[PDB]
Amino acid sequence: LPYDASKWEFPRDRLKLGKPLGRGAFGQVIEADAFGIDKTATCRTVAVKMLKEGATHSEHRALMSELKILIHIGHHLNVVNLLGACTKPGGPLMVIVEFCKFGNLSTYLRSKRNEFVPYKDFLTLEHLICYSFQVAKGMEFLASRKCIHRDLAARNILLSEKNVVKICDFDARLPLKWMAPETIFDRVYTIQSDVWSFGVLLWEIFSLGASPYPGVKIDEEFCRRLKEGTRMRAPDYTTPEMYQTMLDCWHGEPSQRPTFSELVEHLGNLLQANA
């Protein structure tokens, strides 16, 4: 796949690496200041995806692959965007993306259970609904580019400066809890199964950062219930209409669940109705 170096290549000497933002079995992210990464004379903090010390050609083919997908996907305010890359000889392959200072959404929300009042420092129904709305914008975009997230959860939503929230990958979690029933069973992954996932994320937003299916067992009977119509109860901070939206996204038939386009319209209505 082509890599237009004129548009994307950024000089390693303009990149100053800082503290690691995360690790993994293959990749690793690390904070960094890049000068003029957006054509202006400013030092901008960014997130750098680079390989680990001793990474193989397939780990190398992987980072490079994800680089082209990012270039493919394109730009959207509600995704963690590609800013530039270091691919030429004389250094480590590095994929520079936007840095989101507040971290994933779940961890952030949990931290604000004390700083939250439905209506008026504090979060409010407007925040929770604005984050939901933004994630639907972000997903309507990815769906437009014909991408499927496969694991849409709040830990994969990062919070930046303005209350802008961005999707990435576009304490632990049990990823099965976000899986639509046909995905769990027939193992299919479609955007309509991302909407189910979206519904679980909404639930996380209004439970202020909680784990779905509170203390329930994920046995084969769990997936039976789930396939028959069993569903989570309203989280402590939802709006009845936000909960109704969860039930919609959790529809048995993927075709009957709303489309992200439909959800952007609906959440825009709820948001504006919020005032």
Is residue 52 annotated as involved in ligand binding?
Answer: no
Q: Which residues pair with 31 in a beta bridge?
A: 47
Say how far apart CA 65 and CA 73 lie, in whole Å: 12
Domain architecture of the chain: domains with CATH: 1-99 (3.30.200.20), 100-273 (1.10.510.10)
What six digits make up the tokens of 21? 């933002």
Q: Quick one: CA torsion of 180, 185, 187, 188, rounded to 10 degrees?
A: -60
Residue 140 has phi, psi (to 5 degrees) of -65, -35
Contact indicator for 48, 15 with CB cutoff of 8 Å: yes
Is residue 256 annotated as involved in ligand binding?
Answer: no
Burial class (CB in 10 A: 0-12, 13-18, 19+), 266: middle
Between the alpha carbon of residue 1 and those of residues 4, 89, 147, the distances in Å are: 10, 18, 17
Residue 15 has phi, psi (to 5 degrees) of -115, 125
Is residue 55 annotated as involved in ligand binding?
Answer: no
Burial class (CB in 10 A: 0-12, 13-18, 19+), 270: middle
Q: Which of 204, 135, 131, 132 is nearest to 174 (CA)?
A: 204
**Which residues lie closer than 8 Å to 98 by C-beta, 6 or more apart?**
46, 47, 80, 81, 83, 160, 166
Most distant CA pair in the chain, distance: 59
Using only the alpha carbons of the chain, give its radius of gyration: 20
Method used to determine the 3D structure: X-ray
Which residues belong to the active site? 151
Q: Which residues pair with 45 in a beta bridge?
A: 33
Residue 27 has phi, psi (to 5 degrees) of -100, -170
Q: Quick one: CA torsion of 202, 208, 211, 213, rounded to 10 degrees?
A: -60
